[PDB]
Amino acid sequence: KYHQYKINQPEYKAANGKWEIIEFPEKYRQNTIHAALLRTGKVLMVAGSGNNQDNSDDKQYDTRIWDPVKGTIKKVPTPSDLFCTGHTQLANGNLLIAGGTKRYEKLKGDVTKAGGLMVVHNENPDKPITLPAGTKFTGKENGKTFVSKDPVLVPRAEKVRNDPGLGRIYVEAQKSGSAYETGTEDNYRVQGLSGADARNTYGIAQKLALDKKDFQGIRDAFEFDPVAEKYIKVDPMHEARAYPTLTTLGDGKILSVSGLDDIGQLVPGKNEVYDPKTKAWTYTDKVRQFPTYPALFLMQNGKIFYSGANAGYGPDDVGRTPGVWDVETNKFTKVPGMSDANMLETANTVLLPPAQDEKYMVIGGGGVGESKLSSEKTRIADLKADDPKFVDGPSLEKGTRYPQASILPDDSVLVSGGSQDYRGRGDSNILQARLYHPDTNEFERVADPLVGRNYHSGSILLPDGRLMFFGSDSLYADKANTKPGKFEQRIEIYTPPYLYRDSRPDLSGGPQTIARGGSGTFTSRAASTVKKVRLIRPSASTHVTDVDQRSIALDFKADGDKLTVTVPSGKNLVQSGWYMMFVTDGEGTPSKAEWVRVP
Template sequence: MAYRPGTRFRKTAIGTGVVLLLAGLNAPAAIGFAEEQYHEYRISRPGYLAKYGSWQVQDTPDSYRLNAIHATLLHTGKVLLIAGSGNDQEQFDAGTFRTILWDPEKNSYEEIPTPADLFCAGHTQLADGRLLVAGGTARYELLDGDVERAGGRMLVKNEDPDKPVKLKKGTGFIAPSGLVYRTTAKVTVPAADKKTPKRGKAVVTAAEANVFVEAEEEGRGYVQDRQAQYAVEGLTGKDADNVYGLAQKLTMEKQDFQGIKDTFEFDPVKERYVRVDPMDKARWYPTLVTLPDGKVLSVSGLDEAGEILYGDNEIYDPETRKWSKAPKRYFPTYPALFLTQGGKLFYSGANAGYGPADRGRRPGVWDLEDNSFTTVPGLTDPDQLETASSLLLPPAQDQKVMVLGGGGVGESEKSTPRTAVIDLTKDEPVYKEGPRLPQGTRYLNSVIMPDDSVFTSGGSVDYRGRSDSDIHKAQFYDPDTNSFTRAADPEVGRNYHSEAVLLPDGRVATFGSDSLFADKANTRPGTFEQRIEVFSPPYLHRIDEEDRLRIGRGPKRPGRGKEATYEVAGAERVAKARLMRPGSVTHVTDVEQRSIQLDVRKGDGEVTVTVPEDPTLVPPGWYMLFLADGEGVPSEAKWVHVP
């Protein structure tokens, strides 16, 4: 008898005779019902399951359903689902920010107090297993026609070298005309820099900080279309001379989402957020990527005025819990950056959102040492990389990166079925076309599997699923044959704001989806998809559960470049071993997942593996150790910590 995930999969028992009987009634409703029931019957057959796998929607209590924007598998085996305000203006205005911790083994849920609006933050796992979450939402966008108060960026200057200036939210900036504009957030301006040469007069350089301001009253009378200097309300004497604001213009044009500087570490053991040193720059839609030394690079994002950061990147040190400046380089928001062997970063070209169409879109290799960037050619449909999926193909030693699908910039109707693979071990790497997807696809989620395949699912043809264009399909990509094979169709459509992660038992969990409209005619507003659907791959249906490989006792902290021996039930059947970094995904961007091939030596009831020494191949952190047999059926994972 093949493996059955118990209540995770519901089998429909109905025979073809019943279907034919109902169809014979020649009633459309009866025929539709019969077809649906026959479909359920067909996809529950053992042969179908062993070839295509199965899906199961989880039974989630209403009180724990949320708008999942971010999903991370923690080393406790639980999945952290972060919504923040969940792309819901009412929740934002009410200060309702949510995080749910889901235990897939027990299908249990826990509400986690959420200290700020982490909607559209960046995140990655630190070497000790804590999750670093940086940025989020300070203010929701206002579209053209919806802006009622003129506003824009105010550059606050402080010429006093003796003290910083702290201005609370709502501080007024007074124009030469007497009109007042108030800050939408608090702002701190450092003390000015003072240098005293051995000879001559001291030189003071003003410190500065940005803040968004808006008119204290509605109407076009507050529009300022030229640069001006603004006095700060409430300051007198020297303070009034030293502290002032500069604005290029304050308009009633569209106002984009605005980011925050807040940074937190989520402790997976104590299951709570811990506030740490904030970033220097506010960020909304940033990418966080782990470096070989365990530090984290934060790249791109929209700042506190809703403008994209033009190259102001930062590095987080988990030891000091502080940020420092990183090499300057511009990318559109949520760029897909992968750590490669040798320590350079590869930008696949995939991204998710904001930035001009003619800047920062070309893929290439970024050397942080000298801040050089070498573009790579060969990618077809280069204008359709927004909302594309990309990943470091398994095994990571091959150093191949794949791009799948994508769409045009912004609300474009364009989408492409293009896939492409680049071999970064080549002296002059070039993208080469891979097999095409069934149709043009945006928002495709791609997950590395323990058998070295890549599972891809969901997406939509049009922007945010417009015109009922969700794609209810899934497929496996085989890096060895460079081809796709079909998988079972998911019940739930997934587009914008969707995620997928590999679970320790070898299944894949999918979350979220944020359709713009709820009908084909695009007349009804869409609603956020809150159901969790889990895919059980074909390999789980090809073997009895008790016959799967089982990893027993062995070191929890295998050393780099050293052997580690584990007790294994079925050791003689082991064909491969993989270290798999757990997924941490948002906006179809997961730059952390990777699968590392391990050398294997089999013994009597035990298996010895060797962890590569290179931290650019195996960044420090927690990994899932999977063993697979010759048929590609994996064990359940054993969590190990690579220091």
């Protein structure tokens, strides 16, 4: 009862804010893994199968739409397993959603021994090859050995280069324990072959560890319409992709990158572009491979920035280097200086406010695969500088995988939650929140979250300036890691310190449509007190990845109770679509947002 007094005192809330848990009625609960703020002010919450074996088996796919003002929630018919889909807002205001997974079956084997799927390649066009049970596969980089339990038939190659024959087979370590696990893709030598057979036959596997998966991508794509509140089927991708990044390019087309293919292989750099005018997909001409959910942002010069943050898969030495990517020419240029570059899996990335400055922050992360390593660091790259590089920012207390990170209308970034170890192992959720201040490069500690959030979590800024937090998919239920985890179905709302002060500036006049380079006029009785105007793109958050959120500074003029704002001219900076517009006063206190559409 004391703690509860301390955190509800007016002085405390004025310094630190306040958290609140929201539980929904049982019938509306789900494992929310993606969320996006819609222009209607409601929040799309996507579970798909919810990373739940029974729901996959049953084809039980879930979506909700939540009204944060009224507190009502409804179900939305869901046509595909969207749990590992990619998504971003289109110029038309709909959310493009693409990819996902096929039905996934539990892997059979010994739960104490590292393992998973080996894809055997056969380069011989004349003959298939059968590898009997007990065949040994040893990594060429990692040096570790796994053994097949059943025989595998590997078809002949096809002449067309020869395109290898492929055969998948479960493999497993000889002995129990984490020492025999791997964390990244490797090419595996088949023991016992010599000569043309050894030359022609090899295995490729992703991580072979103790949290064993085999997800396989799908091609299905949809536009989520926020007015109709339905997914509208569009043309499918050419490539099946589980866990792809979708990101907007300078021309308004959406680039889809990476993911796992329809047999669980990493897609080998074959990227493609959705044209919203035709509703059709086209391959890009050149290949560039990334791990899953690469953090990819459109820069002001039309190039793409890869922060290095990603959700895993693929080799430890391809697709792992932060840099600037010219999509049209395919040139990639490293941005050097990242600390703890071995701990970029499961880090967050934010394009800091204001987006004009082209400053990116990478936050936390962990070692490849199921590694115990985790990073306390922030790293910042200023892309306008003469020689752009990462430099360390302020540090968290603890090494943090999966931190949530949302831009606020006062230019702070709320950095919250995460865990010290893989999927919250060892009951390692970090119940801590901080505001990061880009102008001073400083962290300030705020009120602790009430619910732990690790893997499969996120956060969303809302139009009234509060924030919603969702998800968390712990591997174990207990600190001793003996019982299976249960997905976290509670959500939370955080009310920041700026709502526990004096009166917020008033604002009306939306929704409006304002073109790049144009102006609009709004009403605020408190116009003379406005210090900053921010156009903030709504989040679409999943797997510690959000390429949609950004906060653009608007020039403005006050004339009595009328504020006139100007949207900047650059199509790369101000991506077509809908935005929240917030006005903040001299004391750092924001209005509620009005919605603005940029054509």
